């Protein structure tokens, strides 16, 4: 029920300099524009319903570890470390080392078709614990761009921020001088 | 241009326990409707038009002491000396004992038809130098009632208010709580 209308709308805002956000089921169309804007693939299309081109990037892998057997659902409590140091989802965090998130998709990407995107801008900075499961992905160059595969809108605690939508807000205007504006009228 | 309508407009507010203020030119307005409710006067009517009625309690009558000779204005530096004490356009001069004020009309009252004024309870609580033109009169049991010859709104100074407006406001709600609840935000 929809799958051309959903590429036009990335594509469009990272050409206009406009920031983008961490949302899951994306990670299957933000492979298409990347590849098609910067290179030229065409026929790496929808994988999630047809699954016929060549060029299939992101197909449908289940767990083949310990815990589920079979073909299951990428889910569960897993642990997720990262890989670089210096971004936006992970100074919020104090600096950490190993943050619990959880995922709820089905989908994998492959670790042999991932040769385009490392010779380009297209770093890492967020693995798994195999060192193989591309889970957090993000463009160099772009002065706002988050990308990843878990959902920090459902953290969203009132003493705690979420990562992606806080710092949009932060880096646009850097607005900082406002609370030494008021004073508490009433008091 | 107007006579029927300016007297039902001040009767009407003192029977519904409305506060009234002090303005000029309504002297001769306010005998007409206090008579024929207190009492049951129907001859004193209007005088500055037609001068025919029997009961005409304020004429016209010019100045006849030193200064003005003849038919001129009742207007100048003239000396007000007030009669009593406790009232609501006195305590708000410090307690004063003869204030300057200016007037700006042509009409007085006279002296001998000012029987029925003394017998109820419309007192002075303002006279002249000569203590026979009545410029300031109250209405006993109202609970504000102001009523004067002289303009106090010209007179309203940033740092000094004026007398009946702000004293009808603040015997209203009496909210003086409210400076303490700010306490200067913009500190």
Known sequence: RGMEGKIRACQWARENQKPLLGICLGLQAAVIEFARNKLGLKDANTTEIDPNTANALVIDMPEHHTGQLGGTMRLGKRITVFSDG????????GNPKSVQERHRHRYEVNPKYVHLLEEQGMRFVGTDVDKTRMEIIELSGHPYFVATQYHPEYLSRPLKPSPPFL?????????????????????
Chains 1, 2 share one sequence.
């Open 86 to 93: 210096p971004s936006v989802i992970r100074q919020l965090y």
């Open 167 to 187: 710092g949009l807000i932060l880096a646009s205007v850097d607005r900082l001088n406002q609370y030494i504006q008021r004073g508490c009228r009433l008091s």
